[PDB]
Amino acid sequence: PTALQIKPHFHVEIIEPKQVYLLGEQGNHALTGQLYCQILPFLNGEYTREQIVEKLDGQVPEEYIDFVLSRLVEKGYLTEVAPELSLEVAAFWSELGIAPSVVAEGLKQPVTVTTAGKGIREGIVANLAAALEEAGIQVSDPTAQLQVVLTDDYLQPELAAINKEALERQQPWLLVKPVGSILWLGPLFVPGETGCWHCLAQRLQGNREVEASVLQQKRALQERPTARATLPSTLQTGLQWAATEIAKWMVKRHLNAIAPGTARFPTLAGKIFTFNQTTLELKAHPLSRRPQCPTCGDRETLQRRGFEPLKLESRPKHPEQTVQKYQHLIGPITGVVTELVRSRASGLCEAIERYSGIFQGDEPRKRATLAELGDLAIHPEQCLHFSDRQYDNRESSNERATVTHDWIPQRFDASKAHDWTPVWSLTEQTHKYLPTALCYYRYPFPPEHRFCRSDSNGNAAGNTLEEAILQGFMELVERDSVCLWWYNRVSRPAVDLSSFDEPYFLQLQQFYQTQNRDLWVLDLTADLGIPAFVGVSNRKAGSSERIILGFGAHLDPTVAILRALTEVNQIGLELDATDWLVNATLAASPYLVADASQPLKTAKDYPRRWSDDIYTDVMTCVEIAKQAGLETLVLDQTRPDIGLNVVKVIVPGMRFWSRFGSGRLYDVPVKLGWREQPLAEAQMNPTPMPF
Amino acid sequence: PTALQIKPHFHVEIIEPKQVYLLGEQGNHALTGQLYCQILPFLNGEYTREQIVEKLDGQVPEEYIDFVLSRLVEKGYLTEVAPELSLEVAAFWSELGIAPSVVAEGLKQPVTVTTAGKGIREGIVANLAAALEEAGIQVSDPTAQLQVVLTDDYLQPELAAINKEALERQQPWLLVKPVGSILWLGPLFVPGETGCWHCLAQRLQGNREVEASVLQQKRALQERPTARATLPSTLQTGLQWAATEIAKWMVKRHLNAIAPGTARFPTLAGKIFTFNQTTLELKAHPLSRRPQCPTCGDRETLQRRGFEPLKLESRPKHPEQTVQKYQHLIGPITGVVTELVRSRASGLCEAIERYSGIFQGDEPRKRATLAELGDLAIHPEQCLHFSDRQYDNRESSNERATVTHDWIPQRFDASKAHDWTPVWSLTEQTHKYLPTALCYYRYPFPPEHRFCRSDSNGNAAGNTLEEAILQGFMELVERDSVCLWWYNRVSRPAVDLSSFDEPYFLQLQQFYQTQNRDLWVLDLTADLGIPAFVGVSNRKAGSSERIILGFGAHLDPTVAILRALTEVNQIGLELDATDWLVNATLAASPYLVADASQPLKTAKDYPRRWSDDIYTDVMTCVEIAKQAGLETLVLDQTRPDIGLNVVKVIVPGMRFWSRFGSGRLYDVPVKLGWREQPLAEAQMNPTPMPF
Ligand SMILES: [Zn+2]
Ligand SMILES: [Zn+2]
């Protein structure tokens, strides 16, 4: 004995001869047939199927009633009555696509309600307790299958203990912030399946840079934490919304116990919702479960990988689609990167890239002295190249530091022990060791002994390790080439653009003439032979030449040039710190002038060395550097939670802005016959730049 | 005597020597100065300014305290205490950017609560009544300055009376639907300022095409309406959310009474919010106040304009930005057009265009007989051109109607009177009269006497009337030209594309060869001399030629051709009803084959007649038609609420698909020497098409 009805969220309207309409606030349906008009009056829940046959005795034979009833179940218009529920309520659950008969049993299980901070008044729990009772849910004192945790802040310290309890009890729990101008629901944490609270917290702490900083400064000071807007109406909204959601999750829980994957409607599982009361904005923030989560995952993950050998494969060459792939990382709570991003998928990769570099604590390392590590170790000076002068004058020079670059660090104390991170030598196929402080952003030093500032030179991302490695390697040769030129102020040959098989170069050049601008490309290729170029554009008239520079390096010189022009273009577009743009002149800047005593570079002056494989090109690159007497090192910074590959390529010896130690910077010009004698440190280009 | 405090939504953290941080959940701020650290301990609301001077007597001179206090007011960090409020509550209002001291006075005014339908249980009012009391608001039996109206449907008939009451009482009222799976707040209607409920309703009825239709069918049947999902938790959410919002509006109301435009935070005024409980989606829907609203506006607006003469100006020639301009029209409730739209700003204009055509009831017209109107009237047959055969066989032909086109209407009964709409004759500068049924979509006929079906031929939109008029005129000549060709199956000369000064034509042509396709353009120009073309692409190999056709007409033949190729391209892209694509062949379709007995059309065969002015071009067009013996009529369908110009250009005599009455269709071929004798009706191209 079990009555049947057209789902209670439909208003049935029968238009006699042959029409029936099912009207619902989130969807309508029509049925066509004289049979439907004759049966549906009895599908109001007041009749069991045995009993519908009685009423249509002379009208419709049983067998056709059965068939029509089966049609309606298959079409999802028919459900078993739920006597123990309002139609109002039954309708809600049926509007969700669920047998309301099932619901009473799903909700009869108990739920417990608790607080995390000290910032939740006693009555607020009682309030929620009431709403849940009114929704048909058992509540008890902390057996329970859901623990609801009311807090005023998701970084409340107490949650760490609570998270552990729930992990070791395998017990779902739900966070709710009902106080404040923005209401937060979830995540509903489910120990086998979702992230833990610590998955959330290492991300959220990353989006409270300030609040962390104040706390630190407050603790330093010590012995020698928040406020909250709340109308009763907003409080009550949040609690009531939560009750709705808890209900939904318990019904889902139930259906799925019975039939795994049967219930598809959305719940708070692994999700946060924020409802802003001042700006009426609703937003979803998805919690990712972090594979390397120290609490609920494998902390040693990166430690392990760092000491395993690097594994590179073939990568033949067979968008804004990227932004979808890494969408779940864009956000103020749940995300690692914020805003819209920073086409823009370029600034997204770079933001994600920079984040990956930030030292979390799990990174591979060994505490040892330089001596202990022996030849596998690399002295940081082999990568920084600050002159002895720079260091000794570091104090006076540092006070005035024009730029973030011109911070001279402190000298490395080799005699002391340090964290050393393993990095893969492609050139020698072994690990070597670089100090961890050079390898990751924000490595925590002892205060005084800051021996470096991490820098992003050689850092790079890609959808594969090999794409990233070539990116980072070319970023390196671009800056080593620009440094050799800029600082030695070297007169360089220009490039016949027509000779290249790219109609765009000459076209863009010409276009600049209509916009009151000249444009040459100088050749910055140095002893690696890898094509490197500057684009020099100056204004034609006006009282300031406004010289804009743009760089590029690639195996294919055409690619390299295109990048240089693109950079000039992006800068040029922005314009309309320093005073280069006001003061610099070709007339007073010989190194910006093409060497007339040397012929123009054509397409034919660049021996081709790039191939269909990116692996091949990496290894081409490595060999080239070995030819120069340089070891190509790589460090994978990729994070399992993020997915996008991030590397730091390191080629010790290769030169970066603002560092004047002995090395290539002086020797290469001479070795290449740009000079009889090396230049002196005091004669290095004192103009600050480029860009 | 009136105490001062740092706004209660900030958590003040003083870091002794020189730092102070104001921490708030929607924004942080830092202050720098030893003075701030010394004064801010006393800006906790416990001290009047007279009293802060006492405490810092020996420390800080009065004058500097005053200055610092003035700084903090100017910077918006300081507010007068509100004794009669929680800090919790004060904080909410300060997080909104408002003196909490002001708030108590704003809320002390009374508000009344009521129902619209029969579908709001008694306790629901009491529920909301309670929430408002708890929020500090007076509630009374229906003096009041806000009437809150709980309903289960926004098209509830009772609202019309309520809307009138409020209009004649100049009394704000707020609609709320707290029942159902989706909660609706607002609009808050404000009689001088917002739309009325009828502004909302003519739009909303437009988005319930079905629900209207069921109601109609139900009433026809008569004497010979909805359901609603509701958990207590969802009900309570909506009521509580509303209380929040009502509060906000009353405080805004208050501040602005005192200082017009002082309060800038958002309220429900002229807005609907929907909060979906099943999919957790929050959406805003803005109510537009309709200038021609019969209830709160000027009904006679269009009536008036229709009989005033058309006013066209100069329009010299000096994007997806359009989609922003008409964004407020895209939506299921408030909007006229739905979905995303239908680049896409093309399908938006067309959707808005079609909507404007729909007969509302306000359109200009005169009830008269053909005879009464005399020569100013135009017989619909002069615009439809159905053959006598078509009409007499209308019954047999109609049963099987292949297409929406092949509905043969009924003959016009001239002897009877009809609604006649005035239309502007550009050619004669007077109004003429066309039956209203031809002029607007969905004109309500008496059932039997349906003498036409409205059609969109000559309909067109633009950001100015003149752009729309040229669009609609060219759409007309495109279809008159294609009809003459198609139906008479006329062999036509091809077009030398190289001869045109457009490198793209030859390039696209070539591209089609790589995609297994040929492509010619035939010249469809007829006796108007206005350039009109078909693009004919056929597959090269495969067992079905899959011939795709694309049309174009413009004064500039290059523009016209470009349109033809673009159309071919859009169709071609879609492919990968009828069986043309399977069965049609060049071999069996002479009219698709270029006439070899006639030379190829070059750029030089098209006398240039377009100019810098669009007005000039309209009038060029009109003159050309007058030369052909044709009156150019225009009817502005633009709606004041929508803004985008929409016209219908009518040129009686010019031919449309599927209509075989005596006229141009037979006479033009002969007049142009394409035939010695006119073709017979039975010999008209019987293949159905084109597209
Ligand atoms: Zn975890
Ligand atoms: Zn109105």
Author numbering:
A (entry chain A), B (entry chain A): 3 to 144, 156 to 237, 250 to 343, 355 to 378, 423 to 656, 667 to 781
Quote from the publication.
The cyanobacterium Prochloron spp. produces multiple macrocyclic cyanobactins, which are known as the trunkamides (seven or eight residues) and the patellamides (eight residues). These natural products originate from two different ribosomal precursor peptides (denoted TruE and PatE), and each ribosomal peptide contains multiple distinct core peptides. Heterocyclization of the multiple cysteine residues in TruE is carried out by the single enzyme, TruD, which by definition is processive. We show by biochemical assay that TruD is an adenylase, not a kinase, and that TruD processes cysteines in a defined order, which we describe. We have shown that the leader sequence (crucially residues 26–37) is required for processivity (heterocyclization of subsequent cysteines).
Domains 1 and 2 of TruD share 21 % sequence identity and structural fold with the enzyme MccB, an adenylase found in the microcin C7 antibiotic production pathway (MccB catalyzes two successive adenylation reactions). Pairwise superposition of TruD with the MccB structure gives a Cα rmsd of 5.4 Å over 219 structurally equivalent residues (MccB lacks the third domain); individual domain superpositions are much lower due to a domain rotation (2.6 Å over 80 residues and 2.0 Å over 152 residues). TruD and MccB possess a similar dimeric arrangement and both share two CXXC motifs in domain 2 that bind a Zn2+ ligated in a tetrahedral arrangement of sulfur atoms. Both motifs are conserved in cyanobactin heterocyclases and these motifs (and associated zinc) are a conserved feature of one class of adenylating enzymes. The coordinatively saturated zinc plays a structural role only12b, in this class of adenylating enzymes. Domain 2 of TruD shares the fold of this class of adenylating enzymes; other members include human ubiquitin-activating enzyme 5 (1.9 Å rmsd over 134 Cαs) and thiamine pyrophosphate biosynthetic enzyme ThiF (2.1 Å over 142 Cαs). There is, however, a subtle topology difference; all the adenylating enzymes that share a fold with TruD have an insertion between the first and second strand of the central β-sheet relative to TruD domain 2. Significantly this means that the ATP binding site of MccB is not fully conserved in TruD. Domain 3 of TruD is a novel fold and has a large negatively charged central cleft. Structural data of course do not establish the mechanism but they are entirely consistent with TruD being an adenylase enzyme.
